[PDB]
Design a binder for this molecule. Structure first.
Ligand SMILES: Cc1cn([C@H]2C[C@H](O)[C@@H](COP(=O)(O)NP(=O)(O)OP(=O)(O)O)O2)c(=O)[nH]c1=O
Ligand SMILES: [Mn+2]
Ligand SMILES: [Mn+2]
Ligand code: NA
Ligand code: NA
Length: 326
DNA sequence: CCGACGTCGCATCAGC
DNA sequence: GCTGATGCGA
DNA sequence: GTCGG
């Protein structure tokens, strides 16, 4: 948190450009700059010092100078004072509401938490649930609670079929003391890149987690990705745990390492690894790393037997999950 | 200067 | 119903 | 908004 003030300013500008301007690359430019400054091991003295960092250009250097001089930024100050920008920024915080829907709602005059609650009938299912647990989703999850959620999920998974392997990824696997949500990778020997010997492989796990009232809600559900809500069980007389977002991803068993690399993160790290992969002449997704031919079209999947193999291909020295927090 | 900016899953809509 | 685009999210 | 070429 050496440059907490700086990275906060940039993050707020990224949010503005994404939610209001709907300029996604501006959003990413700010997020990359915030990331590289976040891991800069010096307390930045000037915008020029920051300009040396990759991702920081002239315009951001000037804002860093203004911030360091006065303690704030006029551009952000004005944005904060604007009703439409402030209202749109807020509505996007509800899960399922993006830049488009937020702007749409404000146009109708729907622009407060209270405005939303009286207009429940104008939200889709995802947005409905996002509103429902708006407060709960603001809260972090302490690693202790994550550890409880881990054993529940992993044990419930064991009961449906002993051949299911469940791995908690995301920030948890990176050893975070607190997480925004729970991210779960799922593998079963009946599901490979070569066939699907069993239907409903993800459904049965969702079903089982619902039966024990762990999973409480569903945002979206397909044959490989579940997006929903879960809650820890509480003892007698004690207040309830907050409801928590949970993502579950069923990935073909033989493609585990690309999957576990993808879902481990971080978000920016994953974005950066694939960007670097392109520079090296590869393409990486959650399933495979494929080489790009002379024409630019991806070839056949390269063999992978570890997370490290993927690092080796794009000529990166390996980094532990706890060192991938960009 | 100026093109390019990771890659994919699910919900939902237009258009047929 | 399908396909392709768009919105939102991992 | 930034950058490689
Ligand atoms: C949001 C996001 C996630 N991911 C991958 C990397 C994340 O670690 C993984 C889980 O998504 P997440 O839970 O939204 N990110 P997290 O677990 O690292 O962070 P947190 O503790 O939930 O805030 O999915 C991307 O590859 N691109 C993205 O834009
Ligand atoms: Mn997470
Ligand atoms: Mn998640
Ligand atoms: Na730079
Ligand atoms: Na949202």
């Amino acid at each position: 948190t050496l440059n907490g003030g700086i990275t906060d300013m940039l993050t707020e500008l990224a949010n503005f450009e994404k939610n209001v301007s709907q300029a996604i690359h501006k959003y990413n430019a700010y997020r990359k700059a915030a990331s590289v400054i976040a891991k800069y091991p010096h307390k930045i003295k000037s915008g020029a010092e920051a300009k040396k960092l990759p991702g920081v250009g002239t315009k951001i250097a000037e804002k860093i100078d203004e911030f360091l001089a006065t303690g704030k930024l006029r551009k952000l100050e004005k944005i904060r004072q604007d009703d439409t920008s402030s209202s749109i920024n807020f509505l996007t915080r509800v899960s399922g509401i993006g830049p488009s829907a937020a702007r749409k709602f404000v146009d109708e005059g729907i622009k407060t938490l209270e405005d939303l609650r009286k207009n429940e009938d104008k939200l889709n299912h995802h947005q409905r649930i996002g509103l429902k647990y708006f407060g709960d989703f603001e809260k972090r999850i302490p690693r202790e609670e994550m550890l409880q959620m881990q054993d529940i999920v992993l044990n419930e998974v064991k009961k449906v079929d002993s051949e299911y392997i469940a791995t908690v990824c995301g920030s948890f696997r990176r050893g975070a003391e607190s997480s925004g949500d729970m991210d779960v990778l799922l593998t079963h020997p009946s599901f490979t890149s070569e066939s699907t010997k069993q239907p409903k492989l993800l459904h049965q796990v969702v079903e089982q987690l619902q039966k024990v009232h762990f999973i409480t809600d569903t945002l979206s559900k397909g044959e490989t990705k579940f997006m929903g809500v879960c809650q820890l069980p509480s003892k007698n007389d004690e207040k309830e745990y907050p409801h928590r977002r949970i993502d579950i991803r069923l990935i073909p068993k033989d493609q585990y390492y690309c999957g576990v690399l993808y879902f481990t993160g971080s978000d920016i790290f994953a974005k950066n690894m694939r960007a670097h992969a392109l520079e090296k002449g590869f393409t990486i997704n959650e399933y495979t790393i494929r080489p790009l031919g002379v024409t630019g079209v991806a070839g056949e999947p390269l063999p992978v037997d570890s997370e490290k193999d993927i690092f080796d291909y794009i000529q990166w020295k390996y980094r532990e999950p706890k060192d991938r927090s960009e």
